[PDB]
Amino acid sequence: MDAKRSAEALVPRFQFERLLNQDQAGRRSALYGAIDGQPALLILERAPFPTSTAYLGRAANTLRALTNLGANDIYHWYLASSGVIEIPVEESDDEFADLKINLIYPCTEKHVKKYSKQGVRFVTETPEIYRDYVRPYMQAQREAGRLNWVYNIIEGRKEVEDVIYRTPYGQDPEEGFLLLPDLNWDRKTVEALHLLGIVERRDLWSLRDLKKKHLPWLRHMREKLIEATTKVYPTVEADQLKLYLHYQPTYYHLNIHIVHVQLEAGATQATGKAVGLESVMEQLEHMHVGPEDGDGSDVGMDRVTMCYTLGEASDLWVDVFEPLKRKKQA
Amino acid sequence: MDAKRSAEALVPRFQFERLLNQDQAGRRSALYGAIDGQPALLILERAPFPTSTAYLGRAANTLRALTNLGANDIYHWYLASSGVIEIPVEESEGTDDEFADLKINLIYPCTEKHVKKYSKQGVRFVTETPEIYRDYVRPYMQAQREAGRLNWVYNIIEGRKEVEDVIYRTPYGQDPEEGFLLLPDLNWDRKTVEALHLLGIVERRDLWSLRDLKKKHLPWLRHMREKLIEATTKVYPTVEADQLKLYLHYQPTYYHLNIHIVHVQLEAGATQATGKAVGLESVMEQLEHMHVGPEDGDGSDVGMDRVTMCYTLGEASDLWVDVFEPLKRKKQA
């Protein structure tokens, strides 16, 4: 393993310059620097704790340093440094690791931008702002071809082996769908289940397109997605799943997240990003039908004001909401 | 300093028995065991990385072990173990300290209450129709209030408790309808502005949860939204209005309306998750556009008690044990 030793030789040559970002409760730091006089990006992460009893049964008894910070009755808190614990013969001479390291070298300005801290803003999207600015932006993104990757999966030309369930392409153009594992799921831990329900029809760009006339479709899709998930993973019951939509979505083709209720909630589930599927259905169900609205078929989410988070490097913040904010402050 | 050394002697005597829970993306493990023949609960946490240049400028060059797992062009990924890095004199009160990679909490002797608190808990997603709210859940809320479970809230509202922890309030009694106070969330260190998490406890006592909100409350809601934001940005001048999110819990942990205020940069966890957190503006918009029927008059009493709400419950909670699990059991063949 010359390439393995070669890659290992890079890390001690890293010359730190500055911290780009620290996140994940402080347990991930993105460092910028240089190796051999060229830009280098080194990402430090605390590793998860081992579950081996060889580790858990020895961690408290092998510390290389331990400092009590305070105590109150039966409560005590400390800082400590891990000692060396060797991995037993039947699980590996290795020791248990406390760090994960990613090194991008040589890195570019694109990597610096990607891993630099990005501020977040909470914006207010009225029906007028959706009509005049956001919906035109969505259209341009789709016309530019940004959904090619989605369409390639829907049509069965990519990630065929990653799909865990689908209706065959073309068999059901209105209510067909496929289930894709989320990139961060190990596909083995059922209680961390996270699937993407990508619908086959192509005319719904986001929940903004949903109207009362889509309530039957929404009911059918909710049942079908839950039915398929609990069929593929039979130890999962219906009341152990949550279905939600993103707004703003990360891409402009309606897709329904399916997560196990036991999955640790992160940004993908947070208020200002995730909207429960049943919550959208109830808003359509009870939305007011005015005298000019006929039977109500076209009453829907494009009448609502939606408030949500955006990153400050996003197109929508830079081109729409920051300028609207500046124009209002003048 | 003797008590400091005494508490340090506890940790190496810990005898591991079993893992109670591992969460926070695997970086927190709650271990159950014994010390001196009595139950002990040891919680291991990965520490945040120092920002000190003395640490960051040496971490890559002092590793005590390093294994490359793979590489692809300019991408390389590894596992590693940290070496010893001493804290420089100008950053340490003591001498011969090294940067720490672990935080440890030891509860000893612990009880069954601590084991329950830190053990993994099953979760269920339930469907609360208006009928189930009427027949089962609202009576449960009422009994909780009648039992006195809100004594702690009222003690703070009335200025008998946590007077020193309130970061802002309207003086009690001055504004009975739109008065409020702001309390820091127990999990916030009260100094890191980008992790800000406040609880807005309203002065009025007749709103138990968002189920009580109706169209007639929309002016009150608009006013409270503004007032909570103005007060937060007044106390924390580096926070702008568009760097805050306001939300309600449903189910809430207690049955007196209270509005969470969080910095947009705060990392989202269970408290913000779908099935628990409901954005304040989302409730207001749901009330704004809700249908007013022919028997509803001017619509003033149309509100959230007409909606079906879906949310998560823990399997040890009263509502699961006494309401939703029995309803589920009776329905199943």
Author numbering:
A (entry chain A): 1 to 92, 96 to 333
B (entry chain B): 1 to 333
Quote the study that presented this structure, word for word.
In the 3′ to 5′ pathway, the mRNA body is processively hydrolyzed by the 10-component cytoplasmic exosome complex (exo-10; exo-9 plus Rrp44/Dis3), followed by the removal of the cap structure of the remaining short RNA fragment by the Scavenger Decapping enzyme DcpS (Dcs1p in yeast). The apo DcpS decapping enzyme assembles into an 80-kDa symmetric homodimer that contains dimeric N- and C-terminal domains that are linked by a flexible hinge region. The enzyme possesses two bipartite active sites that are located at the interface between the N- and C-terminal domains. Upon substrate binding to the C-terminal part of one of the active sites, the N-terminal domain flips over to enclose the mRNA substrate in a well-defined pocket.
Next, we aimed at determining whether this preference in substrate usage is a conserved mechanism, and we focused on the enzymes from Chaetomium thermophilum (a thermophilic filamentous fungus) and humans. The protein crystallized in space group P1 with one dimer per asymmetric unit. The structure was determined by molecular replacement and refined to a resolution of 1.95 Å with good geometry. DcpS forms a symmetric dimer with the same overall fold as the human and mouse protein, indicating that the fold and domain orientation of the protein is conserved despite a relatively low sequence conservation. The C. thermophilum and human apo proteins show a single set of peaks (black contours), which confirms the findings from static crystal structures. Upon addition of an mRNA substrate with one nucleotide (red contours), the C. thermophilum and human enzymes undergo a transition into an asymmetric conformation, thereby forming a catalytically competent active site. On the contrary, an mRNA substrate of three nucleotides does not result in the formation of the closed conformation (blue contours). From these data, we conclude that the length sensing mechanism that we identified in the S. cerevisiae protein is conserved in the C. thermophilum and human enzymes.
